[PDB]
Amino acid sequence: PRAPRTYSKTYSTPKRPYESSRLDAELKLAGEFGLKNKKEIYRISFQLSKIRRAARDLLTRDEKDPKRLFEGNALIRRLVRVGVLSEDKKKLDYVLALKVEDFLERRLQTQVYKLGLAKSVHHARVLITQRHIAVGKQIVNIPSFMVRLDSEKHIDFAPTSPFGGARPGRVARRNAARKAEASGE
Amino acid sequence: ARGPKKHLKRLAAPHHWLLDKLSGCYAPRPSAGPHKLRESLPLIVFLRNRLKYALNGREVKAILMQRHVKVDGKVRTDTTYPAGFMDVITLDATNENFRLVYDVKGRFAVHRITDEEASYKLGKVKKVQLGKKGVPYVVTHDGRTIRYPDPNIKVNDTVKIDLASGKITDFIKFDAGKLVYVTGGRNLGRIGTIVHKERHDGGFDLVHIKDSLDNTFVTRLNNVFVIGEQGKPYISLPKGKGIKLSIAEERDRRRAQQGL
Amino acid sequence: KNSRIAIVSADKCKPKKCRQECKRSCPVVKTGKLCIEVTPTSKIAFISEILCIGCGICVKKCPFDAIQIINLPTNLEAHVTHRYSANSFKLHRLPTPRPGQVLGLVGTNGIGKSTALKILAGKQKPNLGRFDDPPEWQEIIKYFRGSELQNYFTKMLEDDIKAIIKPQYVDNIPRAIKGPVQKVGELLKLRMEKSPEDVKRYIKILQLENVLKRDIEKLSGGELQRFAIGMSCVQEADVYMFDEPSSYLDVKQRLNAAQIIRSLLAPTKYVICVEHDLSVLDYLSDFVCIIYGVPSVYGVVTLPASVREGINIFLDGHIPAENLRFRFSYPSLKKTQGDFVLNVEEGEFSDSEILVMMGENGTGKTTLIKLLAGALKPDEGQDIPKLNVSMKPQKIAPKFPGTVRQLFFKKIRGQFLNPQFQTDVVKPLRIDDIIDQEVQHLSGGELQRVAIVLALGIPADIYLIDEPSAYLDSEQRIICSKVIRRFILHNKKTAFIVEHDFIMATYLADKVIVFEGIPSKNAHARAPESLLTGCNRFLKNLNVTFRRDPNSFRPRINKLDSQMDKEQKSSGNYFFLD
RNA sequence: GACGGAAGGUUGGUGGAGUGAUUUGUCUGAUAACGCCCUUUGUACACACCGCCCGUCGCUAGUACCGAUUGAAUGGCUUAGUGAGGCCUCAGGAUCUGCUUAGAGAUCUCAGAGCGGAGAAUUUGGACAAACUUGGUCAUUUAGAGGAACUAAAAGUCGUAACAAGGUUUCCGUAGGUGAACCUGCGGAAGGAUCAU
RNA sequence: AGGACUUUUACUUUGAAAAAAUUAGAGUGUUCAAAGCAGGCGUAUUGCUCGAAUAUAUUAGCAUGGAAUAAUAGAAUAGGAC
RNA sequence: AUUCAUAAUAACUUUUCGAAUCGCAUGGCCUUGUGCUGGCGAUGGUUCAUUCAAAUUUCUGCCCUAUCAACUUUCGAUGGUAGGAUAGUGGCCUACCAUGGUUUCAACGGGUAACGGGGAAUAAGGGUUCGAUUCCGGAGAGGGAGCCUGAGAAACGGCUACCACAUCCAAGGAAGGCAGCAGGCGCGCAAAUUACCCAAUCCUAAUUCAGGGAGGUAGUGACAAUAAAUAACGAUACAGGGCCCAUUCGGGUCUUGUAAUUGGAAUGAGUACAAUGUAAAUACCUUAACGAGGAACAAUUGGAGGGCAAGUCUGGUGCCAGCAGCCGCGGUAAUUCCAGCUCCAAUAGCGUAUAUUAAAGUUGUUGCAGUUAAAAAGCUCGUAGUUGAACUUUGGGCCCGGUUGGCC
RNA sequence: UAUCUGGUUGAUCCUGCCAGUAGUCAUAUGCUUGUCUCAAAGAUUAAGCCAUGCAUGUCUAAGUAUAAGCAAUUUAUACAGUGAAACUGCGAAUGGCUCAUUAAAUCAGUUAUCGUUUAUUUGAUAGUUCCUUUACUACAUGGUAUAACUGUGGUAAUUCUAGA
Numbered sequence A: 001p002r003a004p005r006t007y008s009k010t011y012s013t014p015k016r017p018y019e020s021s022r023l024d025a026e027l028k029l030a031g032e033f034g035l036k037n038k039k040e041i042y043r044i045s046f047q048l049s050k051i052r053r054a055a056r057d058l059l060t061r062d063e064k065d066p067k068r069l070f071e072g073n074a075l076i077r078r079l080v081r082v083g084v085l086s087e088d089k090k091k092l093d094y095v096l097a098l099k100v101e102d103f104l105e106r107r108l109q110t111q112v113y114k115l116g117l118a119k120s121v122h123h124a125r126v127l128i129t130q131r132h133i134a135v136g137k138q139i140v141n142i143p144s145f146m147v148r149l150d151s152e153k154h155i156d157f158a159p160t161s162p163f164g165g166a167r168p169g170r171v172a173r174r175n176a177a178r179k180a181e182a183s184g185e
Numbered sequence B: 001a002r003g004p005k006k007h008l009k010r011l012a013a014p015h016h017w018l019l020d021k022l023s024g025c026y027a028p029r030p031s032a033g034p035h036k037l038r039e040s041l042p043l044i045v046f047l048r049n050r051l052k053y054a055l056n057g058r059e060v061k062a063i064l065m066q067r068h069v070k071v072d073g074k075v076r077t078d079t080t081y082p083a084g085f086m087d088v089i090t091l092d093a094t095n096e097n098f099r100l101v102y103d104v105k106g107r108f109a110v111h112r113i114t115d116e117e118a119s120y121k122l123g124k125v126k127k128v129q130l131g132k133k134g135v136p137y138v139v140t141h142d143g144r145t146i147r148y149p150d151p152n153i154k155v156n157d158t159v160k161i162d163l164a165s166g167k168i169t170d171f172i173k174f175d176a177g178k179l180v181y182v183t184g185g186r187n188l189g190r191i192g193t194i195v196h197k198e199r200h201d202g203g204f205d206l207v208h209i210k211d212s213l214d215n216t217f218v219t220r221l222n223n224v225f226v227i228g229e230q231g232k233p234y235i236s237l238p239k240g241k242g243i244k245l246s247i248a249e250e251r252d253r254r255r256a257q258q259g260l
Numbered sequence C: 001k002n003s004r005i006a007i008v009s010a011d012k013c014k015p016k017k018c019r020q021e022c023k024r025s026c027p028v029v030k031t032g033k034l035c036i037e038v039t040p041t042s043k044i045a046f047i048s049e050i051l052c053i054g055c056g057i058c059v060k061k062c063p064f065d066a067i068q069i070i071n072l073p074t075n076l077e078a079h080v081t082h083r084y085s086a087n088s089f090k091l092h093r094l095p096t097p098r099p100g101q102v103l104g105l106v107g108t109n110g111i112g113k114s115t116a117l118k119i120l121a122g123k124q125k126p127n128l129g130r131f132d133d134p135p136e137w138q139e140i141i142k143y144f145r146g147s148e149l150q151n152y153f154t155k156m157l158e159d160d161i162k163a164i165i166k167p168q169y170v171d172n173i174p175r176a177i178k179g180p181v182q183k184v185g186e187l188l189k190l191r192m193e194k195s196p197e198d199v200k201r202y203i204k205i206l207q208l209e210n211v212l213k214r215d216i217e218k219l220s221g222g223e224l225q226r227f228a229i230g231m232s233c234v235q236e237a238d239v240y241m242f243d244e245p246s247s248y249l250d251v252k253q254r255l256n257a258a259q260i261i262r263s264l265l266a267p268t269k270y271v272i273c274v275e276h277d278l279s280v281l282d283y284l285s286d287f288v289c290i291i292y293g294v295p296s297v298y299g300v301v302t303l304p305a306s307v308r309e310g311i312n313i314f315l316d317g318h319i320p321a322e323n324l325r326f327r328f329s330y331p332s333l334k335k336t337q338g339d340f341v342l343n344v345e346e347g348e349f350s351d352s353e354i355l356v357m358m359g360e361n362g363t364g365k366t367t368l369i370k371l372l373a374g375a376l377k378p379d380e381g382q383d384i385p386k387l388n389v390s391m392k393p394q395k396i397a398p399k400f401p402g403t404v405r406q407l408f409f410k411k412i413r414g415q416f417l418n419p420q421f422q423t424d425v426v427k428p429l430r431i432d433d434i435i436d437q438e439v440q441h442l443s444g445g446e447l448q449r450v451a452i453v454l455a456l457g458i459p460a461d462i463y464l465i466d467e468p469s470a471y472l473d474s475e476q477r478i479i480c481s482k483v484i485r486r487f488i489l490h491n492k493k494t495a496f497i498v499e500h501d502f503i504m505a506t507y508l509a510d511k512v513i514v515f516e517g518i519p520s521k522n523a524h525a526r527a528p529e530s531l532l533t534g535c536n537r538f539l540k541n542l543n544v545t546f547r548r549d550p551n552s553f554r555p556r557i558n559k560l561d562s563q564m565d566k567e568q569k570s571s572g573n574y575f576f577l578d
Numbered sequence D: 001g002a003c004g005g006a007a008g009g010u011u012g013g014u015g016g017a018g019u020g021a022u023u024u025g026u027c028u029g030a031u032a033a034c035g036c037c038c039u040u041u042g043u044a045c046a047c048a049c050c051g052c053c054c055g056u057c058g059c060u061a062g063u064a065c066c067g068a069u070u071g072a073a074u075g076g077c078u079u080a081g082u083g084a085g086g087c088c089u090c091a092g093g094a095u096c097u098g099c100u101u102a103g104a105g106a107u108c109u110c111a112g113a114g115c116g117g118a119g120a121a122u123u124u125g126g127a128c129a130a131a132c133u134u135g136g137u138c139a140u141u142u143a144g145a146g147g148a149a150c151u152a153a154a155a156g157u158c159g160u161a162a163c164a165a166g167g168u169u170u171c172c173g174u175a176g177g178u179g180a181a182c183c184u185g186c187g188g189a190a191g192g193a194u195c196a197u
Numbered sequence E: 001a002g003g004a005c006u007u008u009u010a011c012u013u014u015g016a017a018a019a020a021a022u023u024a025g026a027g028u029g030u031u032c033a034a035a036g037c038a039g040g041c042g043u044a045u046u047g048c049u050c051g052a053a054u055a056u057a058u059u060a061g062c063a064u065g066g067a068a069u070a071a072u073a074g075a076a077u078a079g080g081a082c
Numbered sequence F: 001a002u003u004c005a006u007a008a009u010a011a012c013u014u015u016u017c018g019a020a021u022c023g024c025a026u027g028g029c030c031u032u033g034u035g036c037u038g039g040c041g042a043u044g045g046u047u048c049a050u051u052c053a054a055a056u057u058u059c060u061g062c063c064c065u066a067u068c069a070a071c072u073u074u075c076g077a078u079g080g081u082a083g084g085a086u087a088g089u090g091g092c093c094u095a096c097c098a099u100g101g102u103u104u105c106a107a108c109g110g111g112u113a114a115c116g117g118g119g120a121a122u123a124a125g126g127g128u129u130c131g132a133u134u135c136c137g138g139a140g141a142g143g144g145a146g147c148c149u150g151a152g153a154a155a156c157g158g159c160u161a162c163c164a165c166a167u168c169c170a171a172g173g174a175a176g177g178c179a180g181c182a183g184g185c186g187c188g189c190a191a192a193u194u195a196c197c198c199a200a201u202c203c204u205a206a207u208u209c210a211g212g213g214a215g216g217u218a219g220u221g222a223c224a225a226u227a228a229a230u231a232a233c234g235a236u237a238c239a240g241g242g243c244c245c246a247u248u249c250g251g252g253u254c255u256u257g258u259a260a261u262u263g264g265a266a267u268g269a270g271u272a273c274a275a276u277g278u279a280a281a282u283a284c285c286u287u288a289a290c291g292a293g294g295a296a297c298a299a300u301u302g303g304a305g306g307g308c309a310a311g312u313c314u315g316g317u318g319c320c321a322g323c324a325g326c327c328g329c330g331g332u333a334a335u336u337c338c339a340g341c342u343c344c345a346a347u348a349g350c351g352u353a354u355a356u357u358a359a360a361g362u363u364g365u366u367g368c369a370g371u372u373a374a375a376a377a378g379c380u381c382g383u384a385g386u387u388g389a390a391c392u393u394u395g396g397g398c399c400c401g402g403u404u405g406g407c408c
Numbered sequence G: 001u002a003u004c005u006g007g008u009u010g011a012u013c014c015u016g017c018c019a020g021u022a023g024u025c026a027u028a029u030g031c032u033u034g035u036c037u038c039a040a041a042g043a044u045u046a047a048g049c050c051a052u053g054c055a056u057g058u059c060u061a062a063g064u065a066u067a068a069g070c071a072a073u074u075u076a077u078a079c080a081g082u083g084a085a086a087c088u089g090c091g092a093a094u095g096g097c098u099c100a101u102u103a104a105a106u107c108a109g110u111u112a113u114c115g116u117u118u119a120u121u122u123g124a125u126a127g128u129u130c131c132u133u134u135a136c137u138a139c140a141u142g143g144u145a146u147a148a149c150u151g152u153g154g155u156a157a158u159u160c161u162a163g164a
């Protein structure tokens, strides 16, 4: 037998499942950004959790330490390239603060809506999950993504499928051919 | 378990062959050879993974079986032959020559060498005793015994070997003021000339070493192996020069300065 | 899924010593109904069959390990390779046409074997007990993937394994294909491709040298079974199948048939026999593969065994998987046709008694019967039957479209109305399906049993019977024979019985007439003498001998020459323990 | 609060006392207060003495333990006796095969005898040691005659032993007796109804 | 090169000696991600090219400073140090 | 550090080695003969080192149990002498001699549903539980014991016998082992196909050209994970914010929701030409030709008294049937039962068991409690164990001199 | 992501459990089931038993090939193209599988063999053996067999084997 392909779960469930404060507040996010499940929210809060604990572990050691410097600069720069944390607070103490809202803002589901063109966030999600849109030459079909700052200006419709160009589609084929042209025998 | 182990899995083999976890269960066990199992590097590993010439084992065998390539300027047709530290891999592919020397991270880089350097190699003398009929002899790290040596050559010293002939062209004594490479373990693939030696009765002579930046350290003498005189190394060193940069200098040079 | 049942007797299965825990801790015993019946006593623990739910709780906590646990045969919509529709026969496992060795395939009659063979050939394709769409090979492959036949069937799809089968029945092959020319001669030449030498070897080692100038229709079923096998053999093909080759043939001529089948096997070829055998399956096959179930309802095929071992398990019954139980006067007439001299001797054809015939195929036993009934002859003298003549045909491949019940109205069910046909078969193996259903689709032993009824059916006493063992096995043969004997002895009749089987002759016999002479030349019928001397006469000429299996009373043919064989040759006796 | 077969003769506002329950006010006959009834104590009751609850007795179901069985089966250990099998040796030499004085007529067996070598069975004695047979020995699940308990009781039968000085203050330790709670001695304690002449 | 002896410990900084895989973790285009150790780059026409780090790894054994805390002693028959 | 490497004498050998081996190209020479020399290898060859290892071995650590306090010493116990035996040291085993070795800082026995590690689960920190399982090491191939052969075995896809099971049979004998792959039976609460293939990654061989269920490739696969379709956009009729140029009385982008009223648009799931993929296919990734408007191509699984989020809605049942992890519901108006309406949770995934971690500061070293709630032993002595006053050189300077931050 | 909440009272505060709660590379089991990637999967009772098939064989320029094989040697009446079979030499002690026993034993880290075996690679390595090297037998290199093979069989049978 060969070595195992390693794995570990990304979502992390809450402790108290029925709570009035959490259920009401978390569902608003889901309604605004258009998240299908609570699992996605929990995933985002798990990544965020990992970042937080890492930052705490960096901060327990002294300043001007080899471990604290390097890791801090790379963590911070990772959080900058994705665009969650802006340029003003690049201090390592600020990454402890942060919030889930910023993370969901940085998802490609809503970055199409924040650009515009897709009207509603739900519509944008539909566009993404139905093979439309692209980061550059590379096509993307997944709502969750994290756009990497430089990628922002290159987001547009893909060459394949309409809006960008190419053929019309199925419904339009049926309207143009099976209905409109087929009237004349 | 009832005799020698012929098979060898991935994972059990050393980390410094850069063997990917997947794309196979097993690894090439190095054949019984000059060098040890864990330190050395198979020829297959040197071909398909490092140099990228061959893809499969098939291709490697087809390259080796037509002579062409040769360790120590000798046929060497077996697939998993242990090419270890400081060995000349002579190829007929556009007159290319290769020396196995350690890197910053304790690996075997594709370090090319001149046609003049291909003539000779080095070797750490491990013991010197009388053989039969009172004839003295030395033994290098790769088992290359040399009959009728110079009495100056004592244990722990280096010998320059001529390959074409089993002879001693030169010898270098073991002390400070010499360029001193270091193999084995934590400080593997570094150079710092020796500051001073330490005796310690009952084995293990920890030597003190001081690199060009004066970041001193200590290593065990068994893993220490010298090279040449101060500012005059008898072999051409690779990129890095046996210094070892910290992670800060790495993030300055290897992911900031080098970019377009 | 199965019916688990308990079993009891053992070596010192001691009820007196144990304080009977079986009784003490069984759930059925402790809820009214006595399943396990025992006491401190001299006998064994008695345990029921019908009651036992299964469980196995007594097994665990019986102090000695006397009581084992068995599983009985029952359908459970499991596997199902094919049905026909409903209230009909179904089949579950068709299997490993394992190559490089001949594969025996054994069972009591009307169990599926033939159907399975057809399925393997790719003529009558399976349907998984469903009413499939146009060529649904895909689905069936998916059903029997994860197993060998995936490869086999896919190969068949692109005819890279060419099909061939020896048919079940013999009378259909000459009638269906009306050839331009008969004989072995040209029709064999058109069939064969293989080579010139192998065919010579076959026809020569088949010890015929008879029917080289003669039409097939004239040939008796025995010399005809032989031809059928020859036509199957020489045909150039990848697959090879022999659906019941060794029926109504001589004991000597069976062995060499088997060894010609053997010829094909070795170099990456697959062979599949079916047979109801004595102990001649020792040479036919290497891999015996028993099938169990209920006749004409369901059939399940067990994974293959070694021949020796498999035959030995067929007898007792239980196996590593399941448990199928199992255990006045006439003158000297001189008769001719064209290429034959069929002479007969005078004899005493006594009242209220049987008469046993034996002989080599082509010894003239059969045409005699025709002439007695009515066909041709004589040029000088004969004795007409006193009693109303009753006849049995060998070449049975009949055609009465509609159903068997309709055809049964031509006889009558209301004579010696007390069992007769029910005493033949009714409780264990059943006759309901055989009494309904078409005769076109009926199998060997059941079709043969159709003709066994057409005998004690029309009002008649004097009886002509040749080859009832055709398409029957040790289960169906012996009881049937016993019933026949009970019929013709009790109510006063006379019957001329003719058998190739040893057990079906010797368990009945008393007066034994013996045929003698070479085929397509001569024929002499010797007078009825004792059972011993007559049988010796029958077998001295054929040059083969038997060995009674000491535990079970069962015949086992010898290996041409051997240590015991030579003693029998020198002594003379070919039948021990009368 | 309620009760006593114990002793004596209404309610919020604000404020204190308390972690509260709440109490104080709404009190000895002045002042943490300002504008049958009662008090104190005892309480295992709180649908509130008709209250709770303790046991002898009958009754369904289980539960372990004890165990008639000089149960039975399976295991490890072992007294005594027996011990195959190879392996090592003392022997043995069926047979095959070299040499030679020597046999036969000019790398020829024809007589044998010596000198050897290879060498199968069989074979004395050893160490190794699987087993087997007898006495046991301990352990283990495993049976289950009937015992002596314990529970789980939908609110039975006789009693009041405790919770009020439960109407013989209450228990502890032991001894004796009693059908049953228990009772009665001896010494102690009070988680007594006395912090006091 | 050395010979001669410096009461011994525990404690603790540093260092090696410290199999990979896993664990935390640096870069990366698995389309994101679990992953994986790939990949970037040219007139993508005979080529160029960084990287597969780093730490974690108690106890036990070694070498190594340090003398605080906690023990342990040479000298009161002075066959006691110079 | 040596009686070491090594040498030199006196010896013995029952005899180790010193190529009677094989292939490619065929020359270079000489007073010229099938003459003298001759390269490139392959495989053998004794010793020495090297490698692969192997075997023993130092110290240090392991799960519960004193209703397991004395064990080991007989035919080995601890030590010594001398031998034998091993590749070897050594009670490993002999003969003699000595009387030791272990231990309550817990030996010896018993249990373990105990192979040991690397690790896994949980996590504030400390911990507790698991580790048959993909790597290292060990052990065993039904139970034991013995042995041939090889460098290497006490080998089991080698052998030998005895025990237990169990096969063919002419009764004369003969052959057995899956805890390798795939399966069949048993036991089960519980687990997959008698499939293809050496193209990979290795390994073995006299070896680039063979063989390898080592392994790899499909299938079966809700054990676990990752991503993530289950529908978006308008128009019309409603209660509205009211916005764009602010020419306040011009028409519709954004709309907050409710409306089987309606018009197009975009797709997948799925069918499949082709190609890719591959040892060869199946998938994936691609993509011609097709494939959404409702019983369409419909998503459930648990709940709705409190804990815990959501119902005092509608009918049946009437302490019955039942629900209920806990408290408790049901005696005829049930916000707990049975259904239906509507709602809530999680959402291609939820519920139910048993084990376990956290919360459990309900094991507590960090970090519990012991007047009355469970708990301080009747009291004292006393060995082990644990702990145990202070006191035995600080200060002062002189320079040399690196690290912090700002005028320079 | 250092968290609690209902259950004993008429109401209170406590000790103290009970139940809830989330996780599980810990399993089963119920219902439901479209896609992609990725995947453990007869361990737990039972190291209980197993039909049957398969899992270790092995060739180059280079050990032995009058196969009475194939296709021909066109350099071959020494073989000297290819090459089944067998002999020889290696391999079969690696692997893969399971965990039953086993508690200072295995085991980890850590030394040591100046108490040793080590096939094979790897590098070195015996000109002195006709011990009468004065004839001594050939060293232009010599003897003993024996499988495959041809043919005669034995047994019911196994990758049983007997003679010649």
Ligand SMILES: Nc1ncnc2c1ncn2[C@@H]1O[C@H](COP(=O)(O)OP(=O)(O)NP(=O)(O)O)[C@@H](O)[C@H]1O
Binding pocket: C084, C088, C089, C107, C108, C109, C110, C111, C112, C113, C114, C115, C116, C244, C295, C296, C433, C437, C441, C442, C443, C444, C445, C446, C471, C472
């Ligand atoms: N086409 C058909 N229609 C109806 N019934 C059929 C058909 N084919 C077979 N059967 C039944 O299936 C049973 C078994 O068929 P088959 O395999 O031919 O029997 P069998 O076992 O070969 N008999 P035999 O060869 O004599 O032992 C028979 O009893 C028939 O009644």
Ligand SMILES: Nc1ncnc2c1ncn2[C@@H]1O[C@H](COP(=O)(O)OP(=O)(O)NP(=O)(O)O)[C@@H](O)[C@H]1O
Binding pocket: C218, C219, C220, C221, C222, C223, C248, C249, C250, C337, C338, C339, C340, C360, C361, C362, C363, C364, C365, C366, C367, C368
């Ligand atoms: N007209 C004819 N000419 C030549 N031969 C014929 C003719 N008719 C029949 N025969 C054959 O003559 C033979 C007589 O033998 P017959 O009595 O049939 O033997 P049988 O009992 O059938 N034995 P079996 O073959 O084992 O059944 C048969 O085999 C017929 O085939």
Ligand code: SF4
Binding pocket: C013, C014, C015, C016, C018, C019, C020, C021, C022, C023, C038, C045, C062, C063, C064, C066, C067
């Ligand atoms: S079977 Fe077991 S229990 Fe039933 S009787 Fe025989 S022994 Fe006693």
Ligand code: SF4
Binding pocket: C005, C006, C026, C027, C028, C029, C035, C036, C047, C051, C052, C053, C054, C055, C056, C057, C058, C059
């Ligand atoms: S088997 Fe099941 S049923 Fe038949 S006896 Fe034993 S227990 Fe009673």
Ligand SMILES: [Mg+2]
Binding pocket: C110, C113, C114, C115, C168, C443, C444
């Ligand atoms: Mg049939």
